Amino acid sequence: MNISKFFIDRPIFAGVLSVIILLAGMIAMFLLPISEYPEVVPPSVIVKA
Amino acid sequence: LGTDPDKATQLVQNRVNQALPRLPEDVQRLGITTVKSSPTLTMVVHLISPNDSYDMTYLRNYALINVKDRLSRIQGVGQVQLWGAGDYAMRVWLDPQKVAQRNLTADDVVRAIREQNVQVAAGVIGASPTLPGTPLQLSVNARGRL
Amino acid sequence: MNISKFFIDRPIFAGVLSVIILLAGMIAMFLLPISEYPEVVPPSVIVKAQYPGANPKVIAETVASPLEEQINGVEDMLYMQSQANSDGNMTITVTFKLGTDPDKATQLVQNRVNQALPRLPEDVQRLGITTVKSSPTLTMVVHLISPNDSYDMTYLRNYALINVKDRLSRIQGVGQVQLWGAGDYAMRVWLDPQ
Amino acid sequence: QYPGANPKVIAETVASPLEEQINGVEDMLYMQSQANSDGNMTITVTFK
Amino acid sequence: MAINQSPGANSLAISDEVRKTMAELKQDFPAGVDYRIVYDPTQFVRSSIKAVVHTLLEAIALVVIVVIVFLQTWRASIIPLIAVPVSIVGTFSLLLLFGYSINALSLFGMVLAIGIVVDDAIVVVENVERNIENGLTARAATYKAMQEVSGPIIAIALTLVAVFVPLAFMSGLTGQFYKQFAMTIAISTVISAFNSLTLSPALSAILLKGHGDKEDWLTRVMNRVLGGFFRGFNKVFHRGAENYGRGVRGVLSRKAVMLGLYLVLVGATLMVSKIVPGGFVPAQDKEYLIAFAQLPNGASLDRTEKVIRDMGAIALKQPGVESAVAFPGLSVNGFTNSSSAGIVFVTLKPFDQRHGKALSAGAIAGALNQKYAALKDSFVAVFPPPPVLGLGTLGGFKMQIEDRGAVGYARLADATNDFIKRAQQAPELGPLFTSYQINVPQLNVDLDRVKAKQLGVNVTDVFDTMQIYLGSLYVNDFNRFGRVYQVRVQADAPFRQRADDILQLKTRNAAGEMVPLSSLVTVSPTFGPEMVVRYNAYTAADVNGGPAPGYSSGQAQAAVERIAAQTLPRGVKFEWTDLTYQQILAGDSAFWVFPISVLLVFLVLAALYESLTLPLAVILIVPMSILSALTGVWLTQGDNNIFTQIGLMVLVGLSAKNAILIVEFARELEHDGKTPFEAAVEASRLRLRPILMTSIAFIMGVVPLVLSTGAGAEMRHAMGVAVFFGMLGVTLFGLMLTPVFYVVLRTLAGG
Amino acid sequence: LGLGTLGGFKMQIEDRGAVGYARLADATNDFIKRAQQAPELGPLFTSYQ
């Protein structure tokens, strides 16, 4: 009922998975939307005359 | 919350368009605008005259002419809003005593402005179809707007 | 590592999977889009307006210029250009960022153009303004022809307009039928000003 | 509405220009206009 | 009638339906009305489809041939025969799921993928057959061979994805093309891997004959008919294998000398990469030319229709020409209407048709240009069509000089001609031309406003007279067959052909007196623009130009930008607008795509070998295949266009696959207690045969694309010799250098 | 709601060649009478007046 046996014996493989996790996070870090809050104010439309 | 801003704007635009002919003529002539509110304020930039050389209407016009559309083309900028004095207009400030002196109504002067400040579709000389071996197609220019 | 064990022992199971792979591939083959190239040209909206007789400068400044004032600053706009011609036509091409949805862009540009619309001369308004998504992908060109000069260009265009154009426009993936040629039929009154 | 106008007049001066413009919208299945003697004009555009 | 298709449409379905509809409608045509399918570019994609289908069959046959020669069992050849079509055909379903399409790029992706899928099948079946030749049974040898390769199969799939999928994430037009190539190849690679683990070994377990059990029906006849050939090829193949073993031993002895040669060759790769001129999307005969006619400024449309008819007749007498599709009045600037300009699209006969050597699209165009040069009423030039309709320039720029400060049409024109005037000095820039014209003849009409109003004449009456008579007002609609058609009034033809026809027009004053405009207006000659183009809400003048294709765009655009900063007067700025403005927005992903992909392949390999250094034994080999390919294109003096680049990419992938199996084999041999030297040699000898099998399959596929004269064999041979040299180098460098790297990295592993 | 006797069809006789409303009714009535003379259809009604 334990997976970690496989990775204990192959530390480079474990590192490869973790480094890939790290690289994915770095790419995403530079693609994310940035703002002070999320979209919490309900959208509205405005008509002027 | 969570309604899509763009479709909501489109629906309200369809409805306002339906309403438009019920409006008075003048509101129609000045126009209606229907726009999605972009609630997220990134920053506010002011145009300024630090020694009062140029006034609020000059500054708003300059913003409109040189700044607003470039900022609005920055990526992720959804809306640039000008807040300040009114935009430029040619104002004619009637002296109603004088207007009556020449026995004129304000209606009359307004008609004069409509008569004498108007573009012209001056026409084209030698345009198709033409009969002989007419050599040139010449468009006509004529000052219409002041 | 024997991931292959289960199938080495069961060749029919393995064949069944590959025949499923194959069958799905053939189905998609008959459902896929076919084209010469992918969508590479950034989408654009086109606004068209006639002002007959007006000089290209008059059209540029009293027709095109207000429309651009209203269009300018639409979301995802890459750039825009208007073109006024001495034959009185005005054409604005608003190009959007690649990956914009053409339909959303056309709806935005249509709203802006409507805002500007009362600013146009009465004659330009009366002839009408149109705003459409450009379909950059040319599938084929079909000409109507009069091979013995029985009928003239305006006749041929009228025929295309009446019987031919809409049948074509209804086909399936046809996004636009565009007629290029002489003008349509009209009642002309040619004054002798003398 | 075109109050007082004859159904043929409505069909030909109201319905016909509107349908000539509507014609060719994307994914349009078909369209029908209907002009009534009480002056009403109704177009139904059915889409895919 | 131009029919334009929607996104995600079916060119073929649409074209067939149009032709069927036209055939049905022609049955109602009044006598004297007909239709012609003037231009049907969907035929292009159709040929590409045939190109794939035929190339697939050829390839399947080839691999079968190769298998029969090397493994000398007809039963082994069924393994590719089924595996390759299943992989390629299966790709379409995942291609659909990701909302891709059958376009020319994706079909080319598939033809390149055929190589990778065929290599997969060869690797699996050769491994099983090799174990059988070691005396095992089909089931047992299939088990052993699959335990030998199933790990490497998964790792190579991942490595190929790591090479290709990052390419799909580039920006702009290049990105949009690579997206098609790479997604198609990646899907095929994943599917082929899955088949390589399930269907190929199961097939070979049930079909490969073990020692014993021979002759059945066809094997006996095949040995009977081809035994002499088998015996001879086995003899020569045996000889080559031992000489190769000697060569590996020699290079492994002088490993340091080998490293020196490798450093030299890496330099040569950089040099040839910079010596071969860059390209993007090569020039394709699209079966028509565009001739432009520009008459003297302000000329009438009747003069233009005469020039256009002459051009058409001249073209119709020119060989290879099929039709003259003419538009008097059509301007190249915007496809809008001009009086003095027109276009004839000269459609050419089909490429396979009587187009011969001297009768080609470039030849036809040059001849038409020479003949049109003797039309003196107009400037005429016939140009080759755009390779992709919608983008044009193909390694050149266009920009817009903008009047931002109400500087007027005249001063803006002066500024733009001054910009062209400073820029033709010598910054490698070319024939910068413009289309901004402000000297088309015109008429200026001066209305004395006070004088009109003293004569009782309204100024709106003067202008309305001018518009209705000279500009033709639209009045209202009239009904005809239930449809609306526009009544328009205008002065008649004789009464508007001529400047002082203005003066003979009469308005009326308030009193009822017809005042002629001879008495309230002056008509004078002047000059102006015919088309006003306003770019980004600024009146603007375009200038377009560029360097030769063996120069890039960025240096040229730096030159124009500097020149404009030097030359443009006050209030007259400029902007870029097209492919160049879109590139300037792009952050050139490539600078992160390639590092990311090499890092990803390194990690994948590191997991497979459990080594931080063995991945290098694969990665260090890939520059060499680039060299092999680039020298090939250089030896034919072609360019590094995106097609040849995706070819380069598949070549790096193939070389990586071969290296990965060589290195993994050496590693397991070393884990069996072999010294790195003997492990490298034994692995290289073990993998030699399958590598040769794939290489020979490709080279025999390249032989028909070299012996195809008289036909459409420009791009056939153009990628042909490139693939020959790419294959030669991929094999040579892989077999002669991966063992060397293995021993070097392996004896630089600890201490 | 929205099916209109699905075990049936509906069709459109179109004046494409400027025939009269009267001549259009003539065509429809000829069609209805000839469809009664073909023994495969049921009762065909119109609302065209």
Ligand SMILES: CCCCCCCCCCCCO[C@@H]1O[C@H](CO)[C@@H](O[C@H]2O[C@H](CO)[C@@H](O)[C@H](O)[C@H]2O)[C@H](O)[C@H]1O
């Ligand atoms: C094993 C390797 C195979 C490589 C496969 C290459 C891609 C093949 C694309 C398959 C075509 C899918 O798209 C399909 O194309 C066919 C013609 O082929 C179109 O067919 C259309 O043109 C043909 C012209 O001969 C007509 O006979 C047909 O009745 C008409 O509908 C279909 O309407 C469309 O659904």
Ligand SMILES: CCCCCCCCCCCCO[C@@H]1O[C@H](CO)[C@@H](O[C@H]2O[C@H](CO)[C@@H](O)[C@H](O)[C@H]2O)[C@H](O)[C@H]1O
């Ligand atoms: C795009 C991101 C992808 C992230 C994931 C990348 C992971 C890459 C996986 C590649 C496959 C690794 O699979 C691994 O293969 C090696 C072969 O070297 C096997 O190991 C092998 O070598 C050992 C040496 O001690 C032998 O004794 C053994 O008999 C054999 O199985 C592992 O049992 C298997 O688990």
Ligand SMILES: CCCCCCCCCCCCO[C@@H]1O[C@H](CO)[C@@H](O[C@H]2O[C@H](CO)[C@@H](O)[C@H](O)[C@H]2O)[C@H](O)[C@H]1O
């Ligand atoms: C199976 C494996 C799959 C492999 C996947 C590989 C994916 C690689 C994705 C590369 C992404 C390229 O896409 C590009 O990313 C960069 C990364 O910041 C962004 O670029 C940005 O980065 C800089 C960082 O200082 C910002 O300051 C700047 O405003 C902008 O240029 C772009 O806005 C985005 O378009």
